[PDB]
């Protein structure tokens, strides 16, 4: 045959944040937040579906697609806030404490959303940064309000306040796009290393030359491995991988293995060579 | 060992469209169109790179990531044009033939961009729809101009003109997102069929029960196959797949095969069962 509660864990942790912004009707930004969540949550309902004929590996990956969307909804939001800050700069006419407690309530609220996403699921590490950004964005108008209120002589420190805080957003979203670009490109995941498994595999008896390895991954923790191995022709074949699986599954967890057990007649070729790093 | 000119074909066909909008400095929207292009082209330069250690399958898939971006740059563009049409509706003050030949030159120009992308590469079928949309968008202001100029009594037919033509954009971009959602989710590609290969494989002698098939695809024409097959224990194993490859490669083209040749002792399980369709 050659053969848990992390799923609803987020559904717990995520549905909360959806309600907070929902209950946050004390007015744009909030409405936009109320949109990213449910959809992203709805994606979390997708990965639960069983693998269908059209999607053989199943809807596992769909989470990231929802996640990667949430990120690009942050760039649009902050994209507006830089252009308006520019408009708020070029049209300098604007007029306080009224604009403080309306933000004094917001900043503390976003801490709630952020702290409950205390770092698993990608959507978690996707909605989290969406909130964190929305926090640092929120303190901009606050930390400015407690500045111009006391020092209204300038009243122009607010634009740069956003400008420096906008970068605090984008410089905090790259760390997630350095990763989700590797997933959608079928690259080796973070927690592993390409040569880190070749040697780890070459440490078994029958193997001769692991050629044409391919190890991509699904969302965050689902990894899939695939390779062709060369075995001692005098040695029995099936028994070897009968351990290699154990040899790998013991090393760490998998979601599907396919090993080919090619025979010791390979035309010693760029395709089954090596990655040139 | 168990072992063309389509690449630069687009680089030919794509660099052209990049120059046309570049040379189109006869004014914004043109600049946005220019930004979308080169990047997408730059992605086409990525897929040429050889497979590296971090990206085992290689940068083939990266094209789609660039492609899928171009699409979402269309929704943003048309997103602006519906809100402005709304603003152009709610603020009805606006005032002709001056606004005709400035568009009479545009519409015909977009035909050039579209016709040279006469339907291969995804980026082709990605930049194409980006242009086609930008055409139907362009005729809106034109077909309206030759209406209100002759019948200025209304001058309100222009908003709905965009509104109906905006849908002509989005209803033309879905056909590409029905597909590129299957690629990034590792689903079986269009040109194939899940059961279409099981039977096509089960038509060989040694095979007993192809279990745990997995057939996803890279960008458009690169397909990868992977499966475990059961063979007659009395029959020799390696010789079977020594044909199955031919049996499939003869059927159509591949980019990597991994077959496991499991033995006839499988615990007759949901995992190696079937996709429930
Ligand atoms: Zn799965
Ligand atoms: Zn091989
Ligand atoms: Zn080779
Ligand atoms: Zn390739
Ligand atoms: Zn098997
Ligand atoms: Zn099974």
B48, B7 in Cβ contact below 8 A?
yes
* CA A211 / ligand 2 centre spacing (Å): 6
Chain A residues lying within 8 Å of B228, measured CB to CB: 2, 258
Q: Give A33: exposed, middle or buried? Use CB within 10 Å, 0-12, 13-18, 19+.
A: buried
CA distance B55 to A275: 9
DSSP A200-244: HHHTSSSB---EEEEEEESSSS-EEEEEE-BB-TTS-SHHHHHHH
CA distance A177 to A63: 15
Across the interface, do B256 and A212 touch by the CB < 8 Å criterion? yes
In Å, how far are A179, A198, A202 from A210, measured between CA atoms?
Answer: 27, 7, 7
Interaxial angle between packed helices A98-116 and A122-148, expressed in degrees from 0 to 180 and rounded to the nearest 10: 160
Q: How was this structure determined?
A: cryo-EM
Instruction: Determine whether the annotation assigns residue A29 to a binding site.
Output: yes
Return the residues preceding each gap in chain B, C–N over 2.5 A, or none: 3, 27, 95, 119, 268
Please work out, in degrees rounded to the nearest 5, the angle formed at the alpha carbon of residue B2 by the alpha carbons of B1 and B4. Answer: 100
Q: Strand A211-217 vs strand A223-228: parallel, antiparallel, or unpaired?
A: antiparallel
Q: What is the torsional sign of CA B234, B239, B245, B251?
A: negative
Q: What is the torsion angle, in degrees rounded to the nearest 10, for the CA atoms of residue B67, residue B73, residue B78 and residue B81?
A: -160
SS3 state at B204: coil
Bridge partners, B227 (sequence order)? B259
Q: Which of B219, B217, B224 is nearest to B259 (CA)?
A: B224
CA distance B272 to B213: 8
Q: Strand B223-228 vs strand B257-259: parallel, antiparallel, or unpaired?
A: parallel
Q: Which helix (H) or strand (E) holds B211?
A: strand B211-217
Chain A residues lying within 8 Å of B54, measured CB to CB: 182, 187-188, 194
8-state DSSP, B246: H
A222, A254 in Cβ contact below 8 A?
no
Q: Which helix (H) or strand (E) holds B258?
A: strand B257-259
Q: Which of A242, A199, A277, A227 is nearest to B2 (CA)?
A: A227
Q: Which of A63, A73, A39, A38 is nearest to A169 (CA)?
A: A73
CA distance A97 to A192: 52
CA distance B173 to B170: 5
Q: Which of A76, A79, A129, A235 is nearest to B75 (CA)?
A: A76
CA distance, residue B193 to nearest chain A CA (Å): 8
Q: Give A31: exposed, middle or buried? Use CB within 10 Å, 0-12, 13-18, 19+.
A: exposed
SS3 state at B235: coil
The angstrom resolution of this structure is: 4.1
Residue whose entry in the numeric block shows the structure tokens 């044909």: B243
* CA A144 / ligand 2 centre spacing (Å): 63
Q: What is the torsion angle, in degrees rounded to the nearest 10, for the CA atoms of residue A195, residue A196, residue A199 and residue A200?
A: -150
CA distance A56 to B213: 8
Structure-token pair, residue A155: 């009243």
Q: Order of strands across the sheet with A223-228?
A: A211-217, A223-228, A257-259
Q: How many CB atoms lie within 10 A of CB B31?
A: 11
CA distance B196 to A3: 26
**Distance of alpha carbon A231 from the chain centroid:** 38
Structure-token pair, residue B66: 């660039």
Structure-token pair, residue B144: 């309206």
Q: How many CB atoms lie within 10 A of CB B35?
A: 12
CA distance B127 to B130: 5
Q: What is the torsion angle, in degrees rounded to the nearest 10, for the CA atoms of residue A205, residue A207, residue A213 and residue A219?
A: -30
CA distance, residue A83 to nearest chain B CA (Å): 14
B208, B244 in Cβ contact below 8 A?
no
CA distance A62 to A73: 17
DSSP A16-78: HHHHHHHTT----HHHHHHHHHHHHHHHHHHTTSPP-SSSSS-TTTHHHHHHHHHHHHHHHHH
* CA B246 / ligand 2 centre spacing (Å): 14
Which residues, including other chains, have CB under 8 Å from residue B87's CB and lie 6 or more apart? none
Q: Which of A265, A262, A247 is nearest to A212 (CA)?
A: A262
Interaxial angle between packed helices B29-46 and B6-22, expressed in degrees from 0 to 180 and rounded to the nearest 10: 160
Bridge partners, B259 (sequence order)? B227
CA distance A29 to A134: 8
Q: Strand A211-217 vs strand B257-259: parallel, antiparallel, or unpaired?
A: unpaired
Q: Give B53: exposed, middle or buried? Use CB within 10 Å, 0-12, 13-18, 19+.
A: middle
Across the interface, do A61 and B188 touch by the CB < 8 Å criterion? no
DSSP A71-89: HHHHHHHHHHHHHHHHHHH
* CA A1 / ligand 6 centre spacing (Å): 6
Helix and strand element counts for chain A (H, E)? 8, 3
Closest partner residue to A275 (CB to CB) among B52, B238, B265 is B52
A215, A246 in Cβ contact below 8 A?
no
CA distance B145 to A122: 49
Across the interface, do B267 and A3 touch by the CB < 8 Å criterion? yes
B257, A259 in Cβ contact below 8 A?
no
Q: Give A96: exposed, middle or buried? Use CB within 10 Å, 0-12, 13-18, 19+.
A: exposed
A112, A121 in Cβ contact below 8 A?
no
Instruction: Determine whether the annotation assigns residue A255 to a binding site.
Output: yes
8-state DSSP, A262: B
Structure-token pair, residue B58: 């290689």
Domains of chain B: 6-183 (1.20.1510.10), 195-259 (3.30.70)
CA distance A165 to A103: 16
End-to-end CA gap in chain B: 36
Chain B residues lying within 8 Å of A270, measured CB to CB: 50
Q: Backbone phi, then psi, for A262, in 5-degree steps?
A: -70, 165
SS3 state at B215: strand
Q: Order of strands across the sheet with B223-228?
A: B211-217, B223-228, B257-259
């Amino acid at each position: 045959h050659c053969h848990a509660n992390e799923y609803a864990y987020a559904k717990w942790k995520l549905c909360s944040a959806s309600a907070i912004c929902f209950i946050f009707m004390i007015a744009a930004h909030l409405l936009i937040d109320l949109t990213s969540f449910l959809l992203s949550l709805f994606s979390l309902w997708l990965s639960s579906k069983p693998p269908s004929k059209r999607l053989t590996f199943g809807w596992h990956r769909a989470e990231i697609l929802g996640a990667l969307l949430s990120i690009l909804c942050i760039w649009v939001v902050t994209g507006v806030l830089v252009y308006l800050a520019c408009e708020r700069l070029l049209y300098p006419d604007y007029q306080a404490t009224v604009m403080i407690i309306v933000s004094s309530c917001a900043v503390a609220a976003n801490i709630v959303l952020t702290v409950v996403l205390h770092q698993a699921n990608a959507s978690v590490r996707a909605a989290f940064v969406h909130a964190l950004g929305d926090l640092f964005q929120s303190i901009s108008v606050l930390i400015s309000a407690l500045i111009i209120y006391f020092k209204p002589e300038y009243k122009i420190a607010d634009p740069i306040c956003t400008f420096i805080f906008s970068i605090l957003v984008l410089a905090s979203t790259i760390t997630i796009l350095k990763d989700f670009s590797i997933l959608l490109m079928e690259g080796v995941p973070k927690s592993l290393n390409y040569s880190g498994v070749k040697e780890l595999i070459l440490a078994v008896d029958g193997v001769l030359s692991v050629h044409s390895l391919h190890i991509w991954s699904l969302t965050m923790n689902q990894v899939i491995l695939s390779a062709h191995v060369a075995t001692a022709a005098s040695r029995d074949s099936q028994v070897v991988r009968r351990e290699i699986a154990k040899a790998l599954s013991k090393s760490f967890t998998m979601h599907s293995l396919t090993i080919q057990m090619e025979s010791p007649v390979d035309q010693d070729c760029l395709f089954c060579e090596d990655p040139c790093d």
